[PDB]
Design a protein around this motif. Sequence first.
Motif, PDB file in Angstrom:
ATOM      1  N   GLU A  65       0.852  -1.180   0.000  1.00 40.02           N
ATOM      2  CA  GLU A  65       0.000   0.000   0.000  1.00 40.02           C
ATOM      3  C   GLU A  65       0.895   1.238   0.000  1.00 40.02           C
ATOM      4  O   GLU A  65       1.136   1.831   1.048  1.00 40.02           O
ATOM      5  CB  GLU A  65      -0.935  -0.013   1.214  1.00 40.02           C
ATOM      6  CG  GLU A  65      -2.015   1.058   1.171  1.00 40.02           C
ATOM      7  CD  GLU A  65      -3.217   0.715   0.311  1.00 40.02           C
ATOM      8  OE1 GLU A  65      -3.917   1.652  -0.120  1.00 40.02           O
ATOM      9  OE2 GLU A  65      -3.463  -0.491   0.092  1.00 40.02           O
ATOM     10  N   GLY A  88       0.812   4.236  -0.802  1.00 38.64           N
ATOM     11  CA  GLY A  88       0.333   5.547  -0.397  1.00 38.64           C
ATOM     12  C   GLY A  88       0.540   5.823   1.093  1.00 38.64           C
ATOM     13  O   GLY A  88       0.494   6.970   1.531  1.00 38.64           O
ATOM     14  N   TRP A 112       3.657  11.937   7.842  1.00 45.82           N
ATOM     15  CA  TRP A 112       2.309  12.296   8.239  1.00 45.82           C
ATOM     16  C   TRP A 112       2.379  13.214   9.452  1.00 45.82           C
ATOM     17  O   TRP A 112       3.254  13.057  10.298  1.00 45.82           O
ATOM     18  CB  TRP A 112       1.522  11.024   8.568  1.00 45.82           C
ATOM     19  CG  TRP A 112       1.282  10.134   7.380  1.00 45.82           C
ATOM     20  CD1 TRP A 112       2.075   9.116   6.941  1.00 45.82           C
ATOM     21  CD2 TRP A 112       0.155  10.185   6.486  1.00 45.82           C
ATOM     22  NE1 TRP A 112       1.531   8.537   5.826  1.00 45.82           N
ATOM     23  CE2 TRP A 112       0.352   9.166   5.524  1.00 45.82           C
ATOM     24  CE3 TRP A 112      -0.991  10.984   6.401  1.00 45.82           C
ATOM     25  CZ2 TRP A 112      -0.561   8.927   4.506  1.00 45.82           C
ATOM     26  CZ3 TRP A 112      -1.889  10.751   5.387  1.00 45.82           C
ATOM     27  CH2 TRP A 112      -1.676   9.732   4.452  1.00 45.82           C
ATOM     28  N   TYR A 164      -6.165   4.204   6.829  1.00 51.02           N
ATOM     29  CA  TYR A 164      -5.627   5.094   5.818  1.00 51.02           C
ATOM     30  C   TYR A 164      -6.625   5.222   4.671  1.00 51.02           C
ATOM     31  O   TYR A 164      -7.141   4.220   4.167  1.00 51.02           O
ATOM     32  CB  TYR A 164      -4.299   4.507   5.341  1.00 51.02           C
ATOM     33  CG  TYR A 164      -3.872   5.004   3.976  1.00 51.02           C
ATOM     34  CD1 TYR A 164      -3.316   6.265   3.814  1.00 51.02           C
ATOM     35  CD2 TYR A 164      -4.061   4.227   2.845  1.00 51.02           C
ATOM     36  CE1 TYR A 164      -2.954   6.735   2.560  1.00 51.02           C
ATOM     37  CE2 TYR A 164      -3.711   4.687   1.589  1.00 51.02           C
ATOM     38  CZ  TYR A 164      -3.142   5.937   1.448  1.00 51.02           C
ATOM     39  OH  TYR A 164      -2.799   6.372   0.199  1.00 51.02           O
ATOM     40  N   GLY A 187      -6.538   7.252   0.884  1.00 46.83           N
ATOM     41  CA  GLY A 187      -5.676   7.973  -0.038  1.00 46.83           C
ATOM     42  C   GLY A 187      -6.422   9.088  -0.771  1.00 46.83           C
ATOM     43  O   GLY A 187      -7.541   9.446  -0.400  1.00 46.83           O
ATOM     44  N   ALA A 207      -6.051  12.844   1.561  1.00 48.21           N
ATOM     45  CA  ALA A 207      -5.456  11.662   2.177  1.00 48.21           C
ATOM     46  C   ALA A 207      -5.342  11.868   3.684  1.00 48.21           C
ATOM     47  O   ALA A 207      -4.989  12.947   4.147  1.00 48.21           O
ATOM     48  CB  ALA A 207      -4.107  11.377   1.569  1.00 48.21           C
ATOM     49  N   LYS A 213      -1.107  14.704   5.147  1.00 45.34           N
ATOM     50  CA  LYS A 213       0.161  14.809   4.440  1.00 45.34           C
ATOM     51  C   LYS A 213       0.770  16.205   4.578  1.00 45.34           C
ATOM     52  O   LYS A 213       1.959  16.371   4.310  1.00 45.34           O
ATOM     53  CB  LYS A 213      -0.023  14.461   2.961  1.00 45.34           C
ATOM     54  CG  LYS A 213      -0.325  12.998   2.687  1.00 45.34           C
ATOM     55  CD  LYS A 213       0.737  12.052   3.172  1.00 45.34           C
ATOM     56  CE  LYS A 213       2.015  12.123   2.366  1.00 45.34           C
ATOM     57  NZ  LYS A 213       3.095  11.324   2.996  1.00 45.34           N
TER      58      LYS A 213
END
Lengths: 124, 124, 124, 124
Positions: free
Chosen positions: B2, B4, B9, B84, B86, B90, B120
């Motif tokens: 995964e 992404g 973060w 999570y 995306g 995200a 992000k």
Amino acid sequence: MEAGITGTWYNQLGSTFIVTAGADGALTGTYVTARGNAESRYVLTGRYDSAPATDGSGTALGWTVAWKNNYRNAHSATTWSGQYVGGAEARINTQWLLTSGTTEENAGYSTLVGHDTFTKVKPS
Amino acid sequence: MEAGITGTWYNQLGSTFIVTAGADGALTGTYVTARGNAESRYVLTGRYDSAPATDGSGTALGWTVAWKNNYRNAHSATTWSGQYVGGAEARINTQWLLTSGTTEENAGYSTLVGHDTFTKVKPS
Amino acid sequence: MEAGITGTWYNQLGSTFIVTAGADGALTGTYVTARGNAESRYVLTGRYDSAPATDGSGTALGWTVAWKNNYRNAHSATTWSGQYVGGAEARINTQWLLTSGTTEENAGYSTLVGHDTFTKVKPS
Amino acid sequence: MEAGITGTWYNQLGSTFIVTAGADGALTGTYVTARGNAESRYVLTGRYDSAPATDGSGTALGWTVAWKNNYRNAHSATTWSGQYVGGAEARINTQWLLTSGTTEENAGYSTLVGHDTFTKVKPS
Ligand SMILES: [Cl-]
Ligand SMILES: [Cl-]
Ligand SMILES: [Cl-]
Ligand SMILES: [Cl-]
Ligand SMILES: [Cl-]
Ligand SMILES: [Cl-]
Ligand SMILES: [Cl-]
Ligand SMILES: [Cl-]
Ligand SMILES: [Cl-]
Ligand SMILES: [Cl-]
Ligand SMILES: [Cl-]
Ligand SMILES: [Cl-]
Ligand SMILES: [Cl-]
Ligand SMILES: [Cl-]
Ligand SMILES: [Cl-]
Ligand SMILES: [Cl-]
Ligand SMILES: [Cl-]
Ligand SMILES: [Cl-]
Ligand SMILES: [Cl-]
Ligand SMILES: [Cl-]
Ligand SMILES: [Cl-]
Ligand SMILES: [Cl-]
Ligand SMILES: [Cl-]
Ligand SMILES: [Cl-]
Ligand SMILES: [Cl-]
Ligand SMILES: [Cl-]
Ligand SMILES: [Cl-]
Ligand SMILES: [Cl-]
């Protein structure tokens, strides 16, 4: 290092885990759900915080299992947070959060909470 | 896998983590508390559950930080459980449990609960 | 109405509560902490959800105690969320959240989580 | 007494509650889910802990809603635990537990956890 953590622990509902406590705070091993074949075995990883215990205080730790193996993909993961106490009544007392992957609409209801007590010998 | 998830973060209170998502479900990296020097950096490890998303459902994951490094030993550990998502907004939406090592007498009050939203880009 | 809820319940750590379940979902009574004098008695109020149980399912309920009486003001409140099961092994299984009033700066660490099992007879 | 609690509060997802804070710690009122007709209205009761705030600390409180009215019986109940802060950015920050009535076998997965922030004006 906290050598007393290393080994096999049983919850009161039929699950097992076998963990190794590494010298610099690593937890690694396998979590086995109640049934108990290869279908039931999952990777676990976590961390523990060793300190020069002053008052037979517990040792803080946590770990995660993602509920995916070669036989199952539950689209979920559980974290356990708790403390290890050694000695004659050795235990790892934990609370856990289980999150499932959801749609945005259902995200509010993604996470279950509960508790597990792990001991060195099986219940019942 | 995964891809992404891999990267940096930020929570809404000034903490950071840099994680790598491994191909078979591993999370590894570093958690940095609000101050943000070496004094503030901790190992994290966890797991995520990748699946063939059917309805842009989130990806379940969890990780642990033991609050011990070369500069601090808080006798504590936090686990985050969440998912999570995306795309353009995200996020990793989480709930967390923070357990401190305690005496048996104080074990009932060992564990705090809360929530973190990671994005992000930094807040404010 | 759920008449089996009405009465006295004991947790496994020495606390007591005496509750009345009202016909239309009210819970009212008194929570008594481990010591057990007037200094230790607090108002409780909550709600329960009675239904025509299909599979000896539990009855969902919750209640709150604010930790203020004529003798103490702990600047805190606990909520219990759980279910009542009647019969020979009657129990109220709960999880609880304890929130203290804090400054904004400390608001992240305001809330403890745990669990209580209540039975009709005292532990030990 | 904490007169600033009394009134209408909105969460960030479309729910409402109208509460009255009584002089000796009672919370009473109605919780309205996102849709917002009589079908959507439920009794709430709880408690708050007023104190002579020293450092604009929050006021601890909690309440319960059993999800049963004349139109719905969800076999469930939610408790909110949190604190009220008054002033220009007035808010009630909460964590909640939602328990459903279950069979004994499914009791481990009875309780969801999450968080709500209530404000005096609607989101969006
Ligand atoms: Cl388990
Ligand atoms: Cl290690
Ligand atoms: Cl399994
Ligand atoms: Cl496997
Ligand atoms: Cl979903
Ligand atoms: Cl257990
Ligand atoms: Cl337990
Ligand atoms: Cl943080
Ligand atoms: Cl991997
Ligand atoms: Cl730090
Ligand atoms: Cl370091
Ligand atoms: Cl302690
Ligand atoms: Cl956050
Ligand atoms: Cl959050
Ligand atoms: Cl208690
Ligand atoms: Cl009633
Ligand atoms: Cl007391
Ligand atoms: Cl009193
Ligand atoms: Cl404070
Ligand atoms: Cl208990
Ligand atoms: Cl319990
Ligand atoms: Cl709501
Ligand atoms: Cl009152
Ligand atoms: Cl509704
Ligand atoms: Cl109604
Ligand atoms: Cl069920
Ligand atoms: Cl909200
Ligand atoms: Cl919130």
